[PDB]
Amino acid sequence: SECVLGQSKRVDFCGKGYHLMSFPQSAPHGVVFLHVTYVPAQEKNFTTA
Amino acid sequence: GKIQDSLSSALGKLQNVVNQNAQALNTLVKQLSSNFGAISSVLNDILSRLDPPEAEVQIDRLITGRLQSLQTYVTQQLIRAAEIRASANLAATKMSECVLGQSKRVDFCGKGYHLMSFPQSAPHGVVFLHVTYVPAQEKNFTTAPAICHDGKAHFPREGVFVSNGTHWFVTQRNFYEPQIITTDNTFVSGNCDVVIGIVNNTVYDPLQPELD
Amino acid sequence: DCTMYICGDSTECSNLLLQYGSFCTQLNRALTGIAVEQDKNTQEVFAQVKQIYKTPPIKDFGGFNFSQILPDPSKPSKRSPIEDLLFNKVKFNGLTVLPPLLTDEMIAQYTSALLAGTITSGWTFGAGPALQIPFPMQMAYRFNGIGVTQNVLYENQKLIANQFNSAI
Amino acid sequence: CSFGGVSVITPGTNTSNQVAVLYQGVNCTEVPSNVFQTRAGCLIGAEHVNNSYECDIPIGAGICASYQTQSIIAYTMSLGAENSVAYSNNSIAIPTNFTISVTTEILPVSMTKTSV
Amino acid sequence: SETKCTLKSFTVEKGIYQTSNFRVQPTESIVRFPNITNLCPFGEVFNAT
Ligand SMILES: *[C@@H]1O[C@H](CO)[C@@H](O[C@@H]2O[C@H](CO)[C@@H](O)[C@H](O)[C@H]2NC(C)=O)[C@H](O)[C@H]1NC(C)=O
Numbered sequence: 001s002e003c004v005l006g007q008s009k010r011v012d013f014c015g016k017g018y019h020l021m022s023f024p025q026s027a028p029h030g031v032v033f034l035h036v037t038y039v040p041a042q043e044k045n046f047t048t049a
Numbered sequence: 050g051k052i053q054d055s056l057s058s059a060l061g062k063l064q065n066v067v068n069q070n071a072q073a074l075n076t077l078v079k080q081l082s083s084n085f086g087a088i089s090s091v092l093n094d095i096l097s098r099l100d101p102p103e104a105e106v107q108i109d110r111l112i113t114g115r116l117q118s119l120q121t122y123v124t125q126q127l128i129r130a131a132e133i134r135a136s137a138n139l140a141a142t143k144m145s146e147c148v149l150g151q152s153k154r155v156d157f158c159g160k161g162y163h164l165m166s167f168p169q170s171a172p173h174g175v176v177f178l179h180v181t182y183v184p185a186q187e188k189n190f191t192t193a194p195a196i197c198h199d200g201k202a203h204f205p206r207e208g209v210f211v212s213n214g215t216h217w218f219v220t221q222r223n224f225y226e227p228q229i230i231t232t233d234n235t236f237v238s239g240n241c242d243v244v245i246g247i248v249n250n251t252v253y254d255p256l257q258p259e260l261d
Numbered sequence: 262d263c264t265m266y267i268c269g270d271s272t273e274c275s276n277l278l279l280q281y282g283s284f285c286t287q288l289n290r291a292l293t294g295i296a297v298e299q300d301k302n303t304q305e306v307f308a309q310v311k312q313i314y315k316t317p318p319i320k321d322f323g324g325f326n327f328s329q330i331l332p333d334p335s336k337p338s339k340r341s342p343i344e345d346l347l348f349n350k351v352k353f354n355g356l357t358v359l360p361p362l363l364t365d366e367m368i369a370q371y372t373s374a375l376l377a378g379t380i381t382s383g384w385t386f387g388a389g390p391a392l393q394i395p396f397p398m399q400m401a402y403r404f405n406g407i408g409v410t411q412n413v414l415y416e417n418q419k420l421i422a423n424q425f426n427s428a429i
Numbered sequence: 430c431s432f433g434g435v436s437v438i439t440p441g442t443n444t445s446n447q448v449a450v451l452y453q454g455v456n457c458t459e460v461p462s463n464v465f466q467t468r469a470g471c472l473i474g475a476e477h478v479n480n481s482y483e484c485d486i487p488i489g490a491g492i493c494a495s496y497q498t499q500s501i502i503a504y505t506m507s508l509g510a511e512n513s514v515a516y517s518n519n520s521i522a523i524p525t526n527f528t529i530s531v532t533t534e535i536l537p538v539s540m541t542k543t544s545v
Numbered sequence: 546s547e548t549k550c551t552l553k554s555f556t557v558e559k560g561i562y563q564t565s566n567f568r569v570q571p572t573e574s575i576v577r578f579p580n581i582t583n584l585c586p587f588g589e590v591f592n593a594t
Pocket residue numbers: 043044045
């Protein structure tokens with residue numbers, strides 16, 4: 001309901017990172033969720049105020 | 050007004066827990082009339098046609114059976130209570146998140162977009178009345194991701210660019226309410242040759258005429 | 262079958278076991294409840310969709326490529342490539358195995374419809390009628406939901422689509 | 430041998446007194462009209478149709494029964510309607526109205542406290 | 546009627562009910578065995594000198 005039919009803001013409920021979207025696949029007696037997330041990269045430091 | 054009709058004319062989840070408990074309590078009492086391999090089911094019948102050395106062996110056969118049956122009753126109640134406990138834990142979370150708040154979780158407080166919830170008490174449980182918003186009566190338009198104007202690319206601040214066939218407007222995404230594209234409801238970033246799907250159209254400046 | 266596991270054919274056993282009351286009726290009720298719960302588990306996970314949605318015959322999704330997870334038309338089961346990989350990795354004395362109510366063809370057909378709903382309508386089919394939107398614009402709506410400004414998607418569309426494709 | 434449970438399918442005595450019978454995972458040639466073989470056993474007293482409806486009484490392996498066409502029939506359940514989204518690379522649908530809907534949800538919180 | 550008896554009621558509501566069992570029946574008893582054999586004399590056990 002919450003990761004395939006919508007976008008979640010709950011932390012770590014749909015993978016690591018900021019949840020973008022999720023796709024379901026059927027397994028024998030089970031389900032597999034492929035979670036697509038956004039992960040930030042290559043940071044620089046700055047002065048701030 | 051329709052909840053009232055549909056109920057007055059559905060509480061199976063509450064009926065089932067009542068039925069299960071009664072069906073178990075009856076099976077417990079109906080076991081007080083089995084022999085388990087004895088001469089009768091009555092202690093006043095083994096204590097009346099047997100001497101004490103022979104009635105011990107027949108009383109123990111009843112004791113073992115009745116202990117087994119009582120302990121089976123007590124195991125199945127632990128397993129049924131662990132399931133009622135999880136249901137009540139979900140009801141306590143729905144009372145917090147749908148009645149004292151507005152939830153954004155999809156399909157947690159009804160089907161649609163949650164507006165509000167109302168609780169009602171039931172015999173051994175709770176009924177939630179979920180009020181949600183459902184969109185209706187859709188039309189198609191044609192879209193673009195950005196608008197090119199003066200060599201710049203414009204994106205909507207909080208909407209979508211749509212076209213009724215010949216003209217270009219901005220709406221909000223869930224309710225159709227078109228507006229003229231101006232520099233107050235769009236923002237600029239970059240030149241209009243890296244986005245794919247840009248269309249050419251004029252972005253209206255409110256100061257430029259009015260001042261002049 | 263409690264009686265056939267215990268006694269088992271013999272008749273001297275059945276009359277002796279009749280003396281224990283309803284011990285075997287309780288056990289069959291307990292096992293039948295479990296078996297009825299297993300179908301409701303699957304109905305609650307997979308039958309979460311009103312209609313059986315289909316993807317259009319083109320695959321113009323903004324450079325995004327979903328071919329490894331869409332159904333395979335050249336198969337009796339119509340599973341996808343990854344659902345085929347997952348399915349290759351996983352009578353007695355009164356004992357019996359009942360079949361599930363849903364075939365796994367039906368389960369694969371529920372999952373492909375959930376997939377085509379998402380790729381074509383975003384999140385609108387989960388709250389009502391499915392409203393089509395182009396995939397790049399839906400991806401840009403989702404970038405807003407994590408707090409990134411939506412030109413970051415449109416100016417990096419090709420790179421973002423390549424990264425998705427390599428991760429898949 | 431072929432031992433197995435016997436189940437009775439009824440539309441409810443407040444509708445009819447006809448009945449169908451499932452011999453579970455028994456080959457339908459060794460049971461002792463409509464005899465129909467299922468992946469779940471041999472069904473007697475229901476006719477097999479070619480339509481597909483929403484599931485009514487679940488038989489198993491995709492087969493359901495209903496009191497429609499009476500008597501008892503067999504078939505393969507229906508997953509649901511069929512909706513076809515007119516997706517394109519530059520088309521959008523936007524709603525022009527709404528409905529306010531209200532639904533119910535029932536939950537057990539307690540059971541009876543017994544002592545022995 | 547077998548359903549009404551299984552439920553112990555006079556009104557059954559719609560559903561599906563397990564009512565009994567079907568068990569094929571076996572006829573005749575074939576007793577197989579081996580060929581060769583003798584009368585196996587006990588006349589040297591009970592009649593020894
Ligand atoms: C931002 O600057 C900080 C220093 O203020 C960097 O942390 C230094 O990192 C180097 C290399 O890993 C270490 O040897 C130093 O000991 C760190 N400084 C301190 C005070 O511990 C940090 O790596 C910089 N990050 C970026 C993205 O530039």
